[PDB]
């Protein structure tokens, strides 16, 4: 059984450093919020990056925390004009029997505005 | 076990309203075609939107029908010149033991041209 | 249980033919490297294409080798300036109990530079 976990975080500036730190923070909190003990529980992780972020290497953030063996993919987030700027989103596919209503989705910084 | 479900639908005009209605129609038919009784069966849902659609909020369509707890992600569809215009595509990851050849994929409106 | 499989391959020229052949080669090797006997084992396959590739139809390559019933999705890879050019990436979601450290990820041609 698989459960997707969503995450989102914003960065104040378009720099690789800011993007790296933000991605790392989000990944760690998504793991913490769901009590995930090992990366072996993750089937894969998909990232989306908004068009206002340039040198975005979210994969390197995952690598720094040891997710070397977790398959990662990064795609351009649909560029809706006027949408929340500078956002890194995550969709982690988690092998778990955790009920859908018990999965914890994480929205940080300005990304909290994304959820009602 | 997980089975992906594909869906595709076109819109006649580039407006949030047209995109919303089309997305909703597609999602409902994909669920209906596969006899899905609860959203809890969905691991996650990924959407792709073509570059000729601007204010596309497919996630709001999913929310309107109650998919609040289903993790969603939306990415830009590879923009191949001359390809079918104004398409909203869906890839639903379904937790099921349904045989691959028994999963029903849904193509609506002009999107029927996508499949041979 | 699901395990993602990553693949990446580069093409020397931006033509549909070059993209088709490369995609096919990558898909076949990813299957071969993991001893996959049937496509029925694949939940879905997601492709990302870099912005320097134009008429990219990776789905047709999958179709040619018989993956008609495997749900496919293709999105634009985040366009980081100066990143490795002309890359077709794959993320295959595999229903298997294979340990995460035993899954074989495939990087071909210039894509070998992507992994340390």
Curated annotation (Swiss-Prot), chains A, B, C:
PROSITE patterns named in the record: CHORISMATE_MUT_1
InterPro entries: Chorismate_mutase_AroH, RutC-like_sf
Catalytic activity: chorismate = prephenate
Residues holding prephenate: 6, 89, 107
Domain Chorismate mutase aroH-type span(s) in chain numbering: 2-116
Modulation of this protein's activity: Inhibited by 40% with 500 uM tyrosine, and a tyrosine concentration as high as 5 mM reduced activity to 5%.
Keywords: Amino-acid biosynthesis, Aromatic amino acid biosynthesis, Cytoplasm, Isomerase
EC number: 5.4.99.5
Pathway note: Metabolic intermediate biosynthesis; prephenate biosynthesis; prephenate from chorismate: step 1/1
Any single biological process term in GO: amino acid biosynthetic process
Superkingdom of the organism of origin: Bacteria
Class of enzymatic activity (EC top level): isomerase
Protein name: Chorismate mutase AroH
Organism (species): Thermus thermophilus
């Amino acid at each position: 059984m698989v459960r997707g976990i969503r995450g989102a975080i914003t960065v104040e500036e378009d720099t690789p450093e800011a993007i790296h730190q933000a991605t790392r923070e989000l990944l760690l909190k998504m793991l913490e919020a769901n009590g995930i003990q090992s990366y072996e529980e993750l089937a894969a992780v998909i990232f989306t990056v908004t068009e206002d972020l340039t040198f975005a290497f979210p994969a390197e953030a995952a690598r720094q925390i040891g997710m070397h063996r977790v398959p990662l993919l990064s795609a351009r987030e649909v560029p809706v004009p006027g949408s929340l700027p500078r956002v890194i989103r995550v969709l982690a596919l988690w092998n778990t029997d955790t009920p859908q209503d018990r999965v914890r989705h994480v929205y940080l910084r300005e990304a909290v505005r994304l959820r009602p």
